[PDB]
Tab-separated table of C-alpha atoms and ligand atoms in Angstrom:
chain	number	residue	atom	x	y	z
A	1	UNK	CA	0.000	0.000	0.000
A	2	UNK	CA	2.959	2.300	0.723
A	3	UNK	CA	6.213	2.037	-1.511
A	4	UNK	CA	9.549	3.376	-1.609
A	5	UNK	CA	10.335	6.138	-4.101
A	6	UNK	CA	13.589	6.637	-3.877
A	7	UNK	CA	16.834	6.734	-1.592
A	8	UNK	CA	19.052	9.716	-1.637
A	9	UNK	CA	22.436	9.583	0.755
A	10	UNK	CA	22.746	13.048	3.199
A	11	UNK	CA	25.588	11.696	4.560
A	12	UNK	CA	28.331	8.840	4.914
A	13	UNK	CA	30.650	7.260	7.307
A	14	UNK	CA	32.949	4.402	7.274
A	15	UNK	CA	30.293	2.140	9.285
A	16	UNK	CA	26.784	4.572	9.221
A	17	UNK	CA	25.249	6.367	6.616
A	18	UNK	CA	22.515	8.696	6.881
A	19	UNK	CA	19.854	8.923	3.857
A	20	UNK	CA	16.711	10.565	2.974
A	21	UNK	CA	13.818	8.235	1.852
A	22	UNK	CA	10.882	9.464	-0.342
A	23	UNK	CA	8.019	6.991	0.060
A	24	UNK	CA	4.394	7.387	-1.115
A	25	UNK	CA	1.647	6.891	1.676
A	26	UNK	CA	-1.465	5.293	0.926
A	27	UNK	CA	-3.396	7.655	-0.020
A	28	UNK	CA	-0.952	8.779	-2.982
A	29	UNK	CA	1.162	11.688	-1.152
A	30	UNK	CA	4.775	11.802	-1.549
A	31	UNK	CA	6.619	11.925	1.987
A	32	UNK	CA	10.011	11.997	3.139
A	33	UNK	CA	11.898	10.427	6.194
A	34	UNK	CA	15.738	10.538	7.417
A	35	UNK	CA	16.566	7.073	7.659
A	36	UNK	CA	20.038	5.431	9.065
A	37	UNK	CA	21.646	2.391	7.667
A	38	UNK	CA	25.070	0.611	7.670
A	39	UNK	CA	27.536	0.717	5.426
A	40	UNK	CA	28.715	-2.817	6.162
A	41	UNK	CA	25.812	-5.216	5.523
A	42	UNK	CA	25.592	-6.968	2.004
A	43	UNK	CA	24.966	-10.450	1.450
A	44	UNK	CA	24.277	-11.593	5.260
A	45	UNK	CA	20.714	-12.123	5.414
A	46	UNK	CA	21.282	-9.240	8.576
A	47	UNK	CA	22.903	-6.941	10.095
A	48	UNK	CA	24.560	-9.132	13.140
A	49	UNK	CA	23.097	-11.624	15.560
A	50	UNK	CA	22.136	-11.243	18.959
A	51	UNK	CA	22.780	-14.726	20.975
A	52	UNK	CA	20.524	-16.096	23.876
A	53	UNK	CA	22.967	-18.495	25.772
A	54	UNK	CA	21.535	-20.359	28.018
A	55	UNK	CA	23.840	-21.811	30.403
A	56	UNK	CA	22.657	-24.960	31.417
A	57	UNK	CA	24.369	-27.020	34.961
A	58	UNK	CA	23.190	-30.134	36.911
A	59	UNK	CA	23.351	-28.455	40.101
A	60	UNK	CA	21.778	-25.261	39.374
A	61	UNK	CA	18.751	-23.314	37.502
A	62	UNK	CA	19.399	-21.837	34.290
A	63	UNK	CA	21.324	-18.871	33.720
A	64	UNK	CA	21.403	-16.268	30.725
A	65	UNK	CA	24.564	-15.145	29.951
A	66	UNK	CA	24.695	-11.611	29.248
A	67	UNK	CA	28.039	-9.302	28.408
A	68	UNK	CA	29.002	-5.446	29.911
A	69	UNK	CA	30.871	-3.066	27.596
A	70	UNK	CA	31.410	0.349	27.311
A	71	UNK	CA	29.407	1.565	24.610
A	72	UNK	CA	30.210	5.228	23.058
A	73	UNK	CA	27.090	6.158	21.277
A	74	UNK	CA	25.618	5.508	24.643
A	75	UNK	CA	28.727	7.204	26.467
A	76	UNK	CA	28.943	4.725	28.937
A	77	UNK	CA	28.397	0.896	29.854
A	78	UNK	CA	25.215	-1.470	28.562
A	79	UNK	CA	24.610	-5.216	29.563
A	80	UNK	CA	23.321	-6.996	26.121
A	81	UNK	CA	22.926	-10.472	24.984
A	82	UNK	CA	26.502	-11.424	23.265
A	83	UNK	CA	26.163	-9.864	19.394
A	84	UNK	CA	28.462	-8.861	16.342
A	85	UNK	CA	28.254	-8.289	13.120
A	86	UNK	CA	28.219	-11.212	10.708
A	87	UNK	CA	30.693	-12.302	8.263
A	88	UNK	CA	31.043	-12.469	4.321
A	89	UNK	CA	29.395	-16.558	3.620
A	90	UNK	CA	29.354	-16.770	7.243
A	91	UNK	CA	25.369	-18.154	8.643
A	92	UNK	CA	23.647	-16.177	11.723
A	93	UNK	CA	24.015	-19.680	13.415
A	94	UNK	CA	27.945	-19.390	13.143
A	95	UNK	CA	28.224	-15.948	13.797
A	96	UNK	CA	26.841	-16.609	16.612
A	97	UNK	CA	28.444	-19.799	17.963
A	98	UNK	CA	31.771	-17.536	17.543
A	99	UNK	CA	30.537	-14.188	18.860
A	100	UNK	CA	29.779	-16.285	22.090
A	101	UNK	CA	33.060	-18.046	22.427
A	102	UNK	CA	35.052	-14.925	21.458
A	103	UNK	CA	33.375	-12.865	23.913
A	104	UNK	CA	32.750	-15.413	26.988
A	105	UNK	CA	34.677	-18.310	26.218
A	106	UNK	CA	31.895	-20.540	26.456
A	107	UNK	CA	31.280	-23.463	23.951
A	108	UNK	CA	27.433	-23.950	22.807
A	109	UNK	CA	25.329	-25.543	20.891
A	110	UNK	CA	22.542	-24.094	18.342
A	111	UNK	CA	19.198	-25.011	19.848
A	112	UNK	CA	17.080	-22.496	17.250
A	113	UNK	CA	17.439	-19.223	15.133
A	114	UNK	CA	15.097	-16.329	14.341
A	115	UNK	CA	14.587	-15.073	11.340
A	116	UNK	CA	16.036	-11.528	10.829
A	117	UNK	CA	14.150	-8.891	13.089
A	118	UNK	CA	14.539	-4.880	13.441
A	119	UNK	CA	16.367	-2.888	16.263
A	120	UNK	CA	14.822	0.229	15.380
A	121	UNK	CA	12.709	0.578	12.176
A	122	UNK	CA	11.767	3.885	13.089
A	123	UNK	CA	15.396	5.079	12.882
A	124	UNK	CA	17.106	2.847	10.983
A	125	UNK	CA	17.167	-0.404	8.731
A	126	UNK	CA	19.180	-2.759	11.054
A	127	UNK	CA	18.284	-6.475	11.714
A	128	UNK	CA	19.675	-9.153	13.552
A	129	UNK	CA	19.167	-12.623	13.858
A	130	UNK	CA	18.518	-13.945	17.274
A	131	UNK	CA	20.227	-17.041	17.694
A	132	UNK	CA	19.233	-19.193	20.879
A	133	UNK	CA	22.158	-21.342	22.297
A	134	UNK	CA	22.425	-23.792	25.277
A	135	UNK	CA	25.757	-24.458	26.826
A	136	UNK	CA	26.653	-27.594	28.603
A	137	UNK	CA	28.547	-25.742	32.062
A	138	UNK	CA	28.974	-28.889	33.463
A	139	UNK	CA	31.552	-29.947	30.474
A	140	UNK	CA	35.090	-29.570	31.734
A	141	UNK	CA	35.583	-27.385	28.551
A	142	UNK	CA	33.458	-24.657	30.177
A	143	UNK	CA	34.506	-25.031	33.801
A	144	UNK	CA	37.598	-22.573	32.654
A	145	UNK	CA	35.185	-19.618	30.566
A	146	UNK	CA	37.873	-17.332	29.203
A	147	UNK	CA	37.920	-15.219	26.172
A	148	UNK	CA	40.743	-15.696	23.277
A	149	UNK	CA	43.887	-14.165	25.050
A	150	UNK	CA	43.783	-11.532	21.564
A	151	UNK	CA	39.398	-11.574	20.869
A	152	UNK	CA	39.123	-8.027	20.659
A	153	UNK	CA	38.365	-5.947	23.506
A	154	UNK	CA	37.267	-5.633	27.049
A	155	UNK	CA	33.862	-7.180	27.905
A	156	UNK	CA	32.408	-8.468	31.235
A	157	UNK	CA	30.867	-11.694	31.369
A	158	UNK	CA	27.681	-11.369	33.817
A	159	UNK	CA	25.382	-14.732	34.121
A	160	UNK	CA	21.745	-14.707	36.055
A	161	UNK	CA	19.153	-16.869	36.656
A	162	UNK	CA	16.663	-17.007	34.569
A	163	UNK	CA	13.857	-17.301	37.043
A	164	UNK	CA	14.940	-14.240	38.040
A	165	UNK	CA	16.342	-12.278	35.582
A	166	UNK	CA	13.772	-9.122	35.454
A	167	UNK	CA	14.488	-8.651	39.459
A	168	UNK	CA	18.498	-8.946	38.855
A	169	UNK	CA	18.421	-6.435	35.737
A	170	UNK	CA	16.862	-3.644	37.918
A	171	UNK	CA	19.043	-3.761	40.184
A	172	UNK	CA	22.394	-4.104	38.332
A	173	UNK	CA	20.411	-0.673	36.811
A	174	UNK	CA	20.102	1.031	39.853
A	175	UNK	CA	24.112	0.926	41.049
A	176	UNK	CA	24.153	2.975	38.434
A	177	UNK	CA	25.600	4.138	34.788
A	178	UNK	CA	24.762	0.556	33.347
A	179	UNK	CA	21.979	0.795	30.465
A	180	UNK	CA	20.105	-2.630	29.666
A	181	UNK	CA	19.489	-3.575	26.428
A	182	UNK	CA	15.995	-3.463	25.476
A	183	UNK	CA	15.735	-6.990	23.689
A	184	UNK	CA	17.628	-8.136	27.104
A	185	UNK	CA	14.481	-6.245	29.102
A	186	UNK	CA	12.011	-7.319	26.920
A	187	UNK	CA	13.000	-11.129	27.136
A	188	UNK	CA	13.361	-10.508	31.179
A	189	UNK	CA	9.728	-9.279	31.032
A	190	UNK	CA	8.512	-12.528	29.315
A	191	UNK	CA	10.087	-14.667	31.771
A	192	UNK	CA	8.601	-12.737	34.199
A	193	UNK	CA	5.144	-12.374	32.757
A	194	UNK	CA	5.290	-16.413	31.994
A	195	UNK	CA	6.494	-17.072	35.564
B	1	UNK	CA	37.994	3.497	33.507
B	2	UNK	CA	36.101	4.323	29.933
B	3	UNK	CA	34.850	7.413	29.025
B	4	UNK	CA	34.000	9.719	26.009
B	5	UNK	CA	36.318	12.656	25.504
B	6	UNK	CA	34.438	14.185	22.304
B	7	UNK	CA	31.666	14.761	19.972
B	8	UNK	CA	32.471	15.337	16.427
B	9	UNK	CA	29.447	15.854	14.222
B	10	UNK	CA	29.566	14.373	10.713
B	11	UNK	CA	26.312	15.577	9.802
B	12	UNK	CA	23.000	16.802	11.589
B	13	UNK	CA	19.317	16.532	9.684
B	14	UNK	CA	16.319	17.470	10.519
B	15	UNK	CA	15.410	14.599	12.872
B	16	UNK	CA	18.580	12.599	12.811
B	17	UNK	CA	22.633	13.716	13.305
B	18	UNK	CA	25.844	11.525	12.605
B	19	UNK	CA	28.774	12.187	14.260
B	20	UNK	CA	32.531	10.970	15.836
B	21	UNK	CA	33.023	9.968	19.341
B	22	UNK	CA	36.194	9.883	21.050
B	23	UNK	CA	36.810	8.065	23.951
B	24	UNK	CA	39.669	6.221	26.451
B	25	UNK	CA	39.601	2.524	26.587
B	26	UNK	CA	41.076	0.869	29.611
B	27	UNK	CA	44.713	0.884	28.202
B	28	UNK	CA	44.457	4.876	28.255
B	29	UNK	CA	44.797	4.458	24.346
B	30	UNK	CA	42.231	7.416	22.107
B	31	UNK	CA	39.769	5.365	20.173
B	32	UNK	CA	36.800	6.397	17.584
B	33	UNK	CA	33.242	5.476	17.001
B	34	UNK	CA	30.551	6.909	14.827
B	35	UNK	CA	27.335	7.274	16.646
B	36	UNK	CA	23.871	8.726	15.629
B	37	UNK	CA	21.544	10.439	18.040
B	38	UNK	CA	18.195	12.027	17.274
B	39	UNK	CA	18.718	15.711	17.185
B	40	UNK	CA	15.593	15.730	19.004
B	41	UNK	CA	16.411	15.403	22.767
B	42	UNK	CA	16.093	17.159	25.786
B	43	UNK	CA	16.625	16.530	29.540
B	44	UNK	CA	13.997	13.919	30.169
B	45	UNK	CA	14.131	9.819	31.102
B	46	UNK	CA	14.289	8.458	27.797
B	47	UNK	CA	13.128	9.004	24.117
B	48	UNK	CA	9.885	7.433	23.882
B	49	UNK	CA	8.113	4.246	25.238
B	50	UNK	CA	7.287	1.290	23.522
B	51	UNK	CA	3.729	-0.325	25.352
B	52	UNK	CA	3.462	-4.031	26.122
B	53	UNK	CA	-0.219	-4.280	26.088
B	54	UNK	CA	-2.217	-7.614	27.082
B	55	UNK	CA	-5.600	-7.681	26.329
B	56	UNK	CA	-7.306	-9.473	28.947
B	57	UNK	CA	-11.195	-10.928	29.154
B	58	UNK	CA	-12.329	-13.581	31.376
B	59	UNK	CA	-12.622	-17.277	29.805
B	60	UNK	CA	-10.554	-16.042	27.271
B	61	UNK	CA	-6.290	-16.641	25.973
B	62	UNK	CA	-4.530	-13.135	26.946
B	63	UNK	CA	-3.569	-11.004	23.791
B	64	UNK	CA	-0.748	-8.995	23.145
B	65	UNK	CA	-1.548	-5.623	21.188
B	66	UNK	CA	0.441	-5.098	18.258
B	67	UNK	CA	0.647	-2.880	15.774
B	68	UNK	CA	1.746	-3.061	11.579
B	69	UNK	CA	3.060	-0.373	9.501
B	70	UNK	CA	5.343	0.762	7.019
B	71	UNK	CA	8.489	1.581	8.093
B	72	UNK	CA	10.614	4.266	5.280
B	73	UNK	CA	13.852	3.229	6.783
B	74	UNK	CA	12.944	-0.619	6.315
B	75	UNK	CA	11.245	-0.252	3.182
B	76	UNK	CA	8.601	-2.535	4.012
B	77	UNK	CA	6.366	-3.526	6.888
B	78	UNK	CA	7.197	-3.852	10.066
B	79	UNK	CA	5.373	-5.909	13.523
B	80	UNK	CA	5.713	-3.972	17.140
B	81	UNK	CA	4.852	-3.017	19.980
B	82	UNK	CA	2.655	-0.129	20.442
B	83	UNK	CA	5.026	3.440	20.904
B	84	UNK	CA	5.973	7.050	20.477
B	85	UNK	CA	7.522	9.820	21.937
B	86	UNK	CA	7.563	11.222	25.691
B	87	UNK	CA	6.459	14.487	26.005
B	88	UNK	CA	7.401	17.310	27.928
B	89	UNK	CA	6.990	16.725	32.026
B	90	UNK	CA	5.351	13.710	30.695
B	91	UNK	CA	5.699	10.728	32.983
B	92	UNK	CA	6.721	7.584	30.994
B	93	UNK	CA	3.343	5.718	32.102
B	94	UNK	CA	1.541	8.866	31.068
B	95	UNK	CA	2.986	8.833	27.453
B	96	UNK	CA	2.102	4.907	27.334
B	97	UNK	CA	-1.245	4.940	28.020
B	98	UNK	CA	-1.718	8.282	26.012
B	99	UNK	CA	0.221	6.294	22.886
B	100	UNK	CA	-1.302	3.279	23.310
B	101	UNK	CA	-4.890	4.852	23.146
B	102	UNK	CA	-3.818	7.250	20.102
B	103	UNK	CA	-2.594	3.975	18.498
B	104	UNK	CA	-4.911	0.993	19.401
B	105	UNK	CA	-7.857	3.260	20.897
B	106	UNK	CA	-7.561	0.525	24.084
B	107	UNK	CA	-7.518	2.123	27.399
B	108	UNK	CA	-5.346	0.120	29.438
B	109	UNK	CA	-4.124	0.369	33.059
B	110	UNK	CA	-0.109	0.701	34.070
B	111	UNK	CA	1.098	-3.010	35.383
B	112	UNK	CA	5.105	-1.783	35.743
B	113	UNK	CA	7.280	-0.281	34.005
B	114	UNK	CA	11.113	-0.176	33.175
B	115	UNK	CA	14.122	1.795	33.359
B	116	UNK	CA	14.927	3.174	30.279
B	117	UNK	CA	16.696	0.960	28.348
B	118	UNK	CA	18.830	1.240	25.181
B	119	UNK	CA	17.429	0.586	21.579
B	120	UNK	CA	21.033	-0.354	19.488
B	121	UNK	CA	23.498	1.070	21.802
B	122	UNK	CA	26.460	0.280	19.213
B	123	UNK	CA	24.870	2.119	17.137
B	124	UNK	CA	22.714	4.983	18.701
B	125	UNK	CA	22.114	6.288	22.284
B	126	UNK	CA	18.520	6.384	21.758
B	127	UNK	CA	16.686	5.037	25.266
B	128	UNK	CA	13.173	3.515	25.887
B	129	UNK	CA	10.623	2.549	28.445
B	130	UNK	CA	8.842	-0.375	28.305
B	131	UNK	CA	5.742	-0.127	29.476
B	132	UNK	CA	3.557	-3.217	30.432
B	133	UNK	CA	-0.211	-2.388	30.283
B	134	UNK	CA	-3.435	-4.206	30.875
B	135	UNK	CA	-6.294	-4.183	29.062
B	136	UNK	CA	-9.646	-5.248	30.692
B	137	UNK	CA	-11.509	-6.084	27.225
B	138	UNK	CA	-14.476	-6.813	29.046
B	139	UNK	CA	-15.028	-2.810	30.075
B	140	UNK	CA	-17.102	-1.238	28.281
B	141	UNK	CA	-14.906	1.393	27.671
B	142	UNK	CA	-12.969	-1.689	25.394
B	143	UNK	CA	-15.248	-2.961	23.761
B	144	UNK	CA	-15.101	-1.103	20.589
B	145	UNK	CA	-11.588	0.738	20.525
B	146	UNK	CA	-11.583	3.636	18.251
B	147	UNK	CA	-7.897	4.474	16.917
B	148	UNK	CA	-6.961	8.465	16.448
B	149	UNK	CA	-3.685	7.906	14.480
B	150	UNK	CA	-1.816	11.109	14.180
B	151	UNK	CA	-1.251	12.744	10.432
B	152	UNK	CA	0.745	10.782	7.886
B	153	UNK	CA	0.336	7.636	10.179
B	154	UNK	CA	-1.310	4.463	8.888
B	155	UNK	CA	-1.294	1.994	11.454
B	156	UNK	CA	-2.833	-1.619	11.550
B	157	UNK	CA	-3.724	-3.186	15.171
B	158	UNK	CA	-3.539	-6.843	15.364
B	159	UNK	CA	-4.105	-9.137	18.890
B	160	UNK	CA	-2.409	-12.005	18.802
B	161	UNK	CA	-2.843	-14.714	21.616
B	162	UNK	CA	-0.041	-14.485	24.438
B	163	UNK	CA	-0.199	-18.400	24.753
B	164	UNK	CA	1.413	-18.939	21.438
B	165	UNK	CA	2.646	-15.550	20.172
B	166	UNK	CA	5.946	-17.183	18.284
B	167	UNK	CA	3.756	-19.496	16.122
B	168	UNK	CA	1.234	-16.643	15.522
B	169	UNK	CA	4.393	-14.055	14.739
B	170	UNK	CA	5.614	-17.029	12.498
B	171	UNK	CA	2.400	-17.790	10.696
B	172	UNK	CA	2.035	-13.997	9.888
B	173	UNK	CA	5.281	-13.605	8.226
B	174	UNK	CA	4.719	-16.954	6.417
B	175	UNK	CA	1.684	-15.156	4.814
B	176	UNK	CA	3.674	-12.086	3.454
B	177	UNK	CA	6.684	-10.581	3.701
B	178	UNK	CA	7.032	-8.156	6.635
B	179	UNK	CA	9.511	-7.842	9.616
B	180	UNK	CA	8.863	-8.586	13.273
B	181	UNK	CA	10.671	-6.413	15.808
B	182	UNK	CA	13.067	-7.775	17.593
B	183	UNK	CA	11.577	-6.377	21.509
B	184	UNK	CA	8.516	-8.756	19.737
B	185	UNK	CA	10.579	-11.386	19.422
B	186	UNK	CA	12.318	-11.819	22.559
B	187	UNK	CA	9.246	-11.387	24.008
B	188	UNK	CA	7.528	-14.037	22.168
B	189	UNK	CA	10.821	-16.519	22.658
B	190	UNK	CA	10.833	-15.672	26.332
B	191	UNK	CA	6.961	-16.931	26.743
B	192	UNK	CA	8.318	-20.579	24.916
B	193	UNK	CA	11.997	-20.843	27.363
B	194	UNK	CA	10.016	-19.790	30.333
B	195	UNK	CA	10.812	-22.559	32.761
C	201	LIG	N1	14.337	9.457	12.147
C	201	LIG	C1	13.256	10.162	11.771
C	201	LIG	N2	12.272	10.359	12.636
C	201	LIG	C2	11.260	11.085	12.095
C	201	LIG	C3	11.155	11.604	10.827
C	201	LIG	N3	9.957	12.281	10.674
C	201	LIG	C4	9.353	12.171	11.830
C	201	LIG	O1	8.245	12.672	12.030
C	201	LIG	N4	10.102	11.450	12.738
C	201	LIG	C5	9.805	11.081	14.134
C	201	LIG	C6	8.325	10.904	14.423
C	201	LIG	C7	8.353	9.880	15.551
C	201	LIG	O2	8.637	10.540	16.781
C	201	LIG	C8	9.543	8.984	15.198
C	201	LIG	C9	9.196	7.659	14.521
C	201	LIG	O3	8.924	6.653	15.530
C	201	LIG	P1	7.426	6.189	15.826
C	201	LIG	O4	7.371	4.991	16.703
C	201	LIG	O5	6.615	6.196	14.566
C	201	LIG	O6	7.073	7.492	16.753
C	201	LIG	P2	5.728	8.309	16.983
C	201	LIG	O7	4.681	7.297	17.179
C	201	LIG	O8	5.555	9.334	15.979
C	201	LIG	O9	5.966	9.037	18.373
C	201	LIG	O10	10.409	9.809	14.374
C	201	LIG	C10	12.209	11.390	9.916
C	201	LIG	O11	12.291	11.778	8.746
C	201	LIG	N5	13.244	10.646	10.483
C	202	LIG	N1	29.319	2.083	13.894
C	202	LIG	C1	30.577	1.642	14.111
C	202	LIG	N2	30.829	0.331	14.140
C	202	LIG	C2	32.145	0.071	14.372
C	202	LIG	C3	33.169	0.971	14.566
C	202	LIG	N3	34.374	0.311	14.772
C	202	LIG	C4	34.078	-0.961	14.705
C	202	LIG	O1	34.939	-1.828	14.848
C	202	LIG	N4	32.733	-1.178	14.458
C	202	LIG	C5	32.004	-2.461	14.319
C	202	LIG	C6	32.713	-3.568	13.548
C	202	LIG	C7	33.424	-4.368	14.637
C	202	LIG	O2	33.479	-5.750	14.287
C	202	LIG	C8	32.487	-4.219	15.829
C	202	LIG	C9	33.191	-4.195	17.172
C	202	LIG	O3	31.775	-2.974	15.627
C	202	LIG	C10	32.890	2.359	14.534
C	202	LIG	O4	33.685	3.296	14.686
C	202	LIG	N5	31.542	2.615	14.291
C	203	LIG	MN1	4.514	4.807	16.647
C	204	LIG	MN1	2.489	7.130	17.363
């Protein structure tokens, strides 16, 4: 009912480009919008993946393993699911497998993948895949979770419960400058609403 | 230990601005990032809210509220939870219920409510509540929910039921091509992992 017109770039980076899209509404007007995109994605069916690693131990409940970073645009720290951009003939469920060892150390397994979703379609036209991965913790392999001596950067590894995730996000919140992710929130809100 | 030490913009539009952020990394080494922020902001607790709305009558499946529409910087359709902007000395509860009525024409009641939380912080710094809201669809008040979308906004409300939101999500992209959001999605995955 509504279509794209055409795409004109306002603006480029080496990663983010800003554009102006003319679209026709449906009643037959013209309109325009400013409209963000990435100057990185091509072939991956997304952007990146977001992975759900559930860590999964005989002798406790299940935990979600989440990551803290220092995140500029946000100008200061952020506790997300693990993510990254994906690679050139590289699947979501790969990316993801190696985004999670890379940044936790942790070896999983694929249990399922989403198809690609939007971060902010309002704003921009970024997609991930979320991928959903279980990892054994009582394998001696993940006794000893610790990053790639050289995987990139400096990122926290923070696991809770998942029967209580909601309650633990809030409060990580509170004490202080740490932003949670809203797919994080929105997944703790499920488990909450679910019970 | 991290921390930004400058804003260069790149480029500033009428709703959207690009621009260069310097900051220290634990090493003390000067590292980039380019960032986008709405140039729409003021002092306030986040952006906007995005409305988690379940539709609840007795004998009946709970529904989540969604909303459809085209999205310019997606090119195509997109699935997501009810939300808009915060406005000024608006509480984030107040803007919810106000956008969720504009939206759906539902008139819901404030269950919680969280912090605000970050939409694609390696990306943007743009910040969200998310607002869970009742709906008692047995009040009369509910029973026949008039929508007053604002202008240039074509929006489609759809209820799907909470008890099996993934395969209902699922069977709605199977029908046509459109995008679910990815708060949706974690959301709807959440309701299946819960315990
Ligand atoms: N990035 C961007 N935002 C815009 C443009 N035009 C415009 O009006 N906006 C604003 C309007 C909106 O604030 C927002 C789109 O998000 P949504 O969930 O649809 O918000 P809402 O329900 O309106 O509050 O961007 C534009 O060209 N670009
Ligand atoms: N938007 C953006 N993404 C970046 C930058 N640097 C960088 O490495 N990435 C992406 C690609 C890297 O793999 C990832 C870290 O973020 C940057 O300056 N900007
Ligand atoms: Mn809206
Ligand atoms: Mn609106």
């Amino acid at each position: 009912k509504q279509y794209i017109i055409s795409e004109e770039l306002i603006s480029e980076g080496k990663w983010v480009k800003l554009e102006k899209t003319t679209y026709m509404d449906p009643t037959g007007k013209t309109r325009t919008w400013e409209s963000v995109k990435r100057t990185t994605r091509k072939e991956q069916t997304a952007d990146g993946v977001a992975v759900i690693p559930v860590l999964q131990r005989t002798l406790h409940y299940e935990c979600i393993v989440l990551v803290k970073q220092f995140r500029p645009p946000m100008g200061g720290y952020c506790i997300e699911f693990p993510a990254g951009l994906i690679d050139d003939g590289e699947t979501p469920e790969a990316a993801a497998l190696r985004e999670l060892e890379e940044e936790t150390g942790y070896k999983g397994d694929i249990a399922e993948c989403s198809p690609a979703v939007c971060m902010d379609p309002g704003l921009s036209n970024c997609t991930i895949h979320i991928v959903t991965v279980t990892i054994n913790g009582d394998d001696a392999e993940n006794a000893r979770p610790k990053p790639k001596p050289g995987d990139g950067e400096f990122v926290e590894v923070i696991s809770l419960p998942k029967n209580d995730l909601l309650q633990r996000l809030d409060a990580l919140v509170a004490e202080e400058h740490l932003t949670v992710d809203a797919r994080v929130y929105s997944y703790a809100l499920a488990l909450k609403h679910a019970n």
